[PDB]
Amino acid sequence: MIIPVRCFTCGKIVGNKWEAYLGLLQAEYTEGDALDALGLKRYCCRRMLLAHVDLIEKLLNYAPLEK
Amino acid sequence: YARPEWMIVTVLPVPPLSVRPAVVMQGSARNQDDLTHKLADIVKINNQ
Amino acid sequence: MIYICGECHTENEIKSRDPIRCRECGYRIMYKKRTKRLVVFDAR
Amino acid sequence: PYANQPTVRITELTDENVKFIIENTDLAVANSIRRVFIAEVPIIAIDWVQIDANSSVLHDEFIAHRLGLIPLTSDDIVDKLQYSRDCTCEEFCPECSVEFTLDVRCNEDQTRHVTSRDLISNSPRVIPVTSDDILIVKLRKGQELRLRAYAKKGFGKEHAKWNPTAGVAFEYDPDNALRHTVYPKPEEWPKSEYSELDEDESQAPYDPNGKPERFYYNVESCGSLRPETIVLSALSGLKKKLSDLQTQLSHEIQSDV
Amino acid sequence: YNGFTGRKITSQIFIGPTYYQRLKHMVDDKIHSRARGPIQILNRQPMEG
RNA sequence: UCAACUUCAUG
Numbered sequence: 001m002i003i004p005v006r007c008f009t010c011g012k013i014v015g016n017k018w019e020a021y022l023g024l025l026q027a028e029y030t031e032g033d034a035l036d037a038l039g040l041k042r043y044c045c046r047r048m049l050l051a052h053v054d055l056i057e058k059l060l061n062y063a064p065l066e067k
Numbered sequence: 068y069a070r071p072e073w074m075i076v077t078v079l080p081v082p083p084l085s086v087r088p089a090v091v092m093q094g095s096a097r098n099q100d101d102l103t104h105k106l107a108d109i110v111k112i113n114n115q
Numbered sequence: 116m117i118y119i120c121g122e123c124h125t126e127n128e129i130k131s132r133d134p135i136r137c138r139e140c141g142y143r144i145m146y147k148k149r150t151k152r153l154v155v156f157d158a159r
Numbered sequence: 160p161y162a163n164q165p166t167v168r169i170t171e172l173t174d175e176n177v178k179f180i181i182e183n184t185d186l187a188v189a190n191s192i193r194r195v196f197i198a199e200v201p202i203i204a205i206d207w208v209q210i211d212a213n214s215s216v217l218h219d220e221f222i223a224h225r226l227g228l229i230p231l232t233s234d235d236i237v238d239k240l241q242y243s244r245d246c247t248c249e250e251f252c253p254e255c256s257v258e259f260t261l262d263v264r265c266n267e268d269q270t271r272h273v274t275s276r277d278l279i280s281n282s283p284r285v286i287p288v289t290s291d292d293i294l295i296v297k298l299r300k301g302q303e304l305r306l307r308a309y310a311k312k313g314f315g316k317e318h319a320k321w322n323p324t325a326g327v328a329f330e331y332d333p334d335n336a337l338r339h340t341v342y343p344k345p346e347e348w349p350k351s352e353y354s355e356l357d358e359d360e361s362q363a364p365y366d367p368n369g370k371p372e373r374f375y376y377n378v379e380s381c382g383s384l385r386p387e388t389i390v391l392s393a394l395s396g397l398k399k400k401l402s403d404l405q406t407q408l409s410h411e412i413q414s415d416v
Numbered sequence: 417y418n419g420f421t422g423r424k425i426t427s428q429i430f431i432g433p434t435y436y437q438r439l440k441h442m443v444d445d446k447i448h449s450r451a452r453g454p455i456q457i458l459n460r461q462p463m464e465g
Numbered sequence: 466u467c468a469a470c471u472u473c474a475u476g
């Protein structure tokens with residue numbers, strides 16, 4: 001739903017890297033090159049960003065219960 | 068222990084209420100067991 | 116209590132034994148609204 | 160009949176990483192040092208959350224989880240702070256905990272990214288490793304997150320939120336000479352970064368009298384503690400565990416006498 | 417490397433990222449115990465479920 | 466704190 005803080009396997013913080021990952025993907029960088037630029041080295045951490053599905057954006061489309 | 072005449076039904080045994088419990092909902096209503104309804108039918112026909 | 120409206124999201128106060136209809140929108144789905152008492156969550 | 164004298168050589172030292180080599184040490188001591196890196200180095204993390212208002216899509220305990228996983232600078236005061244159990248005061252106080260507050264509302268139309276930057280600490284030494292930022296939640300217009308949190312000292316044995324390190328790389332015998340791992344086809348196996356072998360030789364010759372020594376460590380910090388002080392705190396904590404064990408052992412021996 | 421002792425595991429182990437699913441069957445929903453609890457009306461025997 | 470029925474899952 002939202003990018004997890006900390007990779008499950010090791011615990012490196014991956015929560016701060018999702019917006020930068022998306023921006024690098026918009027730049028031109030391939031997924032692997034963007035992951036390298038963010039500093040993700042072990043495949044455990046690269047799985048976190050590479051396989052993440054951001055549903056929080058779809059959930060934000062619904063209007064809040066209390067405005 | 069068993070005479071052939073006793074096989075023919077002249078008196079129908081009515082089971083106790085333990086055999087046919089009254090099924091209670093919310094105290095608002097009391098459904099009756101299938102046996103109670105069948106015995107009611109039998110009593111009606113017998114009275115007729 | 117105070118019930119938030121389902122559609123117009125405006126809090127309306129409905130007494131007991133009163134029909135559930137929001138004033139000014141008429142929607143029939145209200146929500147009870149979060150409690151004042153606070154619950155502690157362990158971050159674990 | 161006595162302990163060997165270990166030696167340390169630090170190869171790399173960066174704000175996020177310490178690469179070092181420990182020589183003339185036992186495998187058990189080295190492995191337990193690594194184990195203490197992971198699990199028994201104290202750190203500061205949020206363990207109490209009280210959410211006054213959460214209209215975000217994520218439920219309250221999801222928000223609390225994410226807040227707990229957020230690293231917090233614990234370089235100096237984690238040694239000063241006491242555990243909540245040790246502290247005399249009921250619940251939590253400045254000595255046993257640190258207080259954070261979050262009051263964010265998305266008044267504007269554009270989606271508001273609540274970050275670790277929005278967490279405000281009562282004591283300046285603990286900050287959420289902000290000096291991007293960890294994203295706690297995204298708020299649509301009209302959605303608000305208000306909460307108070309208390310961060311306490313603890314170590315990774317309690318919960319992984321208190322792990323001070325990301326990945327501890329531990330290797331010994333880079334070229335297989337003790338044959339602790341027996342390769343079915345040695346040539347197919349990639350050389351280690353610490354390997355000193357020539358490219359032709361897949362494995363070093365079997366050393367019958369050898370013992371695991373010259374352990375290689377790479378300790379990556381999560382940012383809460385500096386990677387050097389993770390290792391120093393681990394050594395000190397292991398020494399303190401041994402000293403407590405010795406004190407209890409002496410007391411029980413005296414009792415038996 | 418063995419986590420408890422630090423020694424290399426002799427047999428090299430197959431590791432990789434595989435997708436795993438959490439099925440809805442959880443132990444907390446299944447654990448059950450009975451001791452002189454509620455009893456049915458007709459059979460006067462322990463209830464079901 | 467009822468009971469019948471159905472369907473869907475678990476071995």
Ligand SMILES: CO[C@@H]1[C@H](O)[C@H](n2cnc3c(=O)nc(N)[nH]c32)O[C@H]1COP(=O)(O)OP(=O)(O)OP(=O)(O)O
Binds near residue numbers: 476
């Ligand atoms: C091995 O035999 C067992 C038992 O006989 C018992 N059992 C299961 N279903 C039934 C049933 O409908 N009726 C009756 N009477 N018994 C039943 O289950 C059988 C096996 O079934 P399975 O073949 O699916 O076991 P996997 O081989 O599949 O095991 P995985 O790798 O998933 O753990």
Ligand SMILES: [Zn+2]
Binds near residue numbers: 011012043044045046
């Ligand atoms: Zn990782």
Ligand SMILES: [Zn+2]
Binds near residue numbers: 125
């Ligand atoms: Zn309304």
Ligand SMILES: [Zn+2]
Binds near residue numbers: 246251252253254
């Ligand atoms: Zn205190």
